[PDB]
């Protein structure tokens, strides 16, 4: 689609749009889970490095 002349835009809908939305947010919802686990374990150990 990038090769088409100017003035034509592609919009993803249906299943494809949901796939894109799911793929976009993976990193945020892995990093946040990792940080939450880090914080909880640090709380329950009283040690930052443990």
């Amino acid at each position: 689609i990038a090769k088409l002349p100017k003035g034509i835009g592609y919009e993803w809908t249906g299943i494809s749009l949901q796939e894109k939305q799911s793929e976009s947010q993976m990193a945020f919802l892995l990093g946040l889970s990792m940080l939450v686990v880090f914080l909880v374990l640090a709380a329950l150990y009283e040690s930052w490095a443990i």
Binding site: L35, L39, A42, A43, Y45, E46, S47
Partner: protein, 50 residues
Amino acid sequence: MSQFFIRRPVFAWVIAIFIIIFGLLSIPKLPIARFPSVAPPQVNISATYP
């Protein structure tokens, strides 16, 4: 009694980090406007007979 959190610095700092993280996540999502919805809600029926 609060001797637990002086005995546990990591535990207090972790709760503080939780608070900071949730606050920073929440701030962007909050709407921003000059005044709240103080004015009573209004509904307007309109009629026209030429």
